[PDB]
Design a protein around this nucleic acid. Sequence first.
DNA 1: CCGACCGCGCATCAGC
DNA 2: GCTGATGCGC
DNA 3: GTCGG
Length: 326
Amino acid sequence: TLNGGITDMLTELANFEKNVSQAIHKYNAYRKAASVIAKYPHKIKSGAEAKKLPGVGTKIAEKIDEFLATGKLRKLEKIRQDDTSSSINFLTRVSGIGPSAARKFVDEGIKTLEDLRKNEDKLNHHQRIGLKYFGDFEKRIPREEMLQMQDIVLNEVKKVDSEYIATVCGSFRRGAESSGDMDVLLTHPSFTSESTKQPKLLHQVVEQLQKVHFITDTLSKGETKFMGVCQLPSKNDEKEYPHRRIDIRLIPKDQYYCGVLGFTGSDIFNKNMRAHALEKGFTINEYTIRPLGVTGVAGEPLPVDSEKDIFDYIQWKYREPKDRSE
DNA sequence: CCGACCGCGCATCAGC
DNA sequence: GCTGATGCGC
DNA sequence: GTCGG
Ligand SMILES: Nc1nc2c([nH]c(=O)n2[C@@H]2O[C@H](COP(=O)(O)OP(=O)(O)OP(=O)(O)O)[C@@H](O)[C@H]2O)c(=O)[nH]1
Ligand SMILES: [Cl-]
Ligand SMILES: [Mn+2]
Ligand SMILES: [Mn+2]
Ligand SMILES: [Mn+2]
Ligand SMILES: [Mn+2]
Ligand SMILES: [Mn+2]
Ligand code: NA
Ligand code: NA
Ligand code: NA
């Protein structure tokens, strides 16, 4: 909010390059600039003041100057007028409709929430569920509701097998007041980097959650990752809780801390941390952290006793999950 | 000026 | 039936 | 779009 005017302008330009222009590296450049601006202590009064920041070049600087002088920007304003640009921008809001499927729909004459409803035969399962809970998914979850889901989920996993360990991560683990979805990390001692000694490990947990009438739908489902929809219970005819997105990822137990680091966030923070890993001779992943010599190929995974242990390898001062949201 | 911008799981589909 | 390319969300 | 090289 200190510079929300610039960030919101850089954010919309980021989503325009990703959904319409399909230039993912411009989308990342705008997001990297909007993030480093959102952490700037002083109030931005110059485009030249912004270009000193890492991630803000000349073109964004003049875009910033044009904003501070007028309160608007002609580039973004003309994109808002473009019917096809705004139609693709809206179609991508449906989960499962990416930049390519959205553009194909627009060239076919499908560009509204009803147009998608009339052509439900053209959408796959993930896209229909995204259509079904379009409004519910745009709503975000207060942390108080997240705590109810945390205890619903963490108790349902030990109903199946008390040697289950579920860790709610993501925005919730970063201490956010309200969250877009729920990200669950699940471990079982019979699943490690060397062998899987029990099958249906993730399946048993997903099946139990929907027997309690928690999980309502399934977007993706495999042996390791589950993407679906959940819902809190309601009593005494109170207005039903809105449906929420939930992701469940079963992880090797011996790779727990690198996965907690990878699925805590933020996505911009993990990117900057991973980039600074090769800066010092390591490669950080959702599973491992392998050293880098001169081979150009990663070495064997390193012992990781903590989440701070990964910080220690690249000699980064440990940052609590609350300060990892960038 | 210039190339490098992370890497994973799952679904769908074309081609066989 | 299968494998590979690709889209998608992260 | 940005920046290290
Ligand atoms: N590899 C990779 N991981 C990502 C990306 N984006 C992204 O959010 N993640 C990881 O995915 C985890 C959860 O994704 P998410 O959509 O729930 O984002 P979030 O929890 O930070 O925010 P939110 O749930 O409040 O909307 C994050 O901890 C993050 O590390 C990405 O683009 N690439
Ligand atoms: Cl270039
Ligand atoms: Mn119509
Ligand atoms: Mn989200
Ligand atoms: Mn999340
Ligand atoms: Mn609903
Ligand atoms: Mn240690
Ligand atoms: Na700069
Ligand atoms: Na989408
Ligand atoms: Na997620």
